[PDB]
Amino acid sequence: VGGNYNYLYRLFRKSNLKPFERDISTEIYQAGSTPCNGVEGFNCYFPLQ
Amino acid sequence: RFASVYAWNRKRISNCVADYSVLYNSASFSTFKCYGVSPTKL
């Protein structure tokens, strides 16, 4: 009921995976021009949801 | 000067060039979200 939010997926990423590749990084990556480091202020996302 | 709420002004634009990458990326913007499209296209 509260939601099984213990399971996660990649919402935002910079590159496509190769077959059977796993990537478990929690680093914030930029979407646009702003460095946006350690924040989700503008033009970036924390990649997992 | 902006159209007011309940006095909107939706301008039709065609047969031209626009840079949506700049429109999206500039630091002057407070927020941005797309629906089936991406600003990186132009």
Swiss-Prot record, chain A:
Q: Which cysteines are joined by disulfide bonds?
A: C36-C44
Q: Which domain of life is it from?
A: Viruses
Annotated region (Receptor-binding motif) at: 1-49
Give, from the UniProt record, the effect of changing E40D. Increased replication in human TMEM106B overexpressing cells
Reported effect of changing A31V?
Answer: Increased resistance to neutralizing antibodies
Tell me what happens on changing G2S: In strain: Omicron/BA.1, Omicron/BA.2.75, Omicron/XBB.1.5, Omicron/EG.5.1
Q: What is the effect of changing Q49R?
A: In strain: Omicron/BA.1, Omicron/BA.2, Omicron/BA.2.12.1
Q: What is the effect of changing Y9F?
A: In strain: B.1.1.298
Q: What segment(s) does the record annotate as region Disordered? A: 11-46
Which region ranges are annotated with the description Immunodominant HLA epitope recognized by the CD8+?
4-12
Subunit structure comment from the entry? Binds to host ACE2. RBD also interacts with the N-linked glycan on 'Asn-90' of ACE2. Cleavage of S generates a polybasic C-terminal sequence on S1 that binds to host Neuropilin-1 (NRP1) and Neuropilin-2 (NRP2) receptors. Interacts with host integrin alpha-5/beta-1 (ITGA5:ITGB1) and with ACE2 in complex with integrin alpha-5/beta-1 (ITGA5:ITGB1). May interact via cytoplasmic c-terminus with M protein. May interact (via N-terminus) with host bilirubin and biliverdin, thereby preventing antibody binding to the SARS-CoV-2 spike NTD via an allosteric mechanism.
Biological function: Attaches the virion to the cell membrane by interacting with host receptor, initiating the infection. The major receptor is host ACE2. When S2/S2' has been cleaved, binding to the receptor triggers direct fusion at the cell membrane. When S2/S2' has not been cleaved, binding to the receptor results in internalization of the virus by endocytosis using host TFRC and GRM2 and leading to fusion of the virion membrane with the host endosomal membrane. Alternatively, may use NRP1/NRP2 and integrin as entry receptors.
What's the protein called, per UniProt?
A: Spike protein S1
Q: Write down the species.
A: Severe acute respiratory syndrome coronavirus 2 (2019-nCoV)
This protein's encoding gene? S
Please specify the portion of the entire protein covered by the chain, as first and last position out of its full length.
Answer: 445 to 493 of 1273
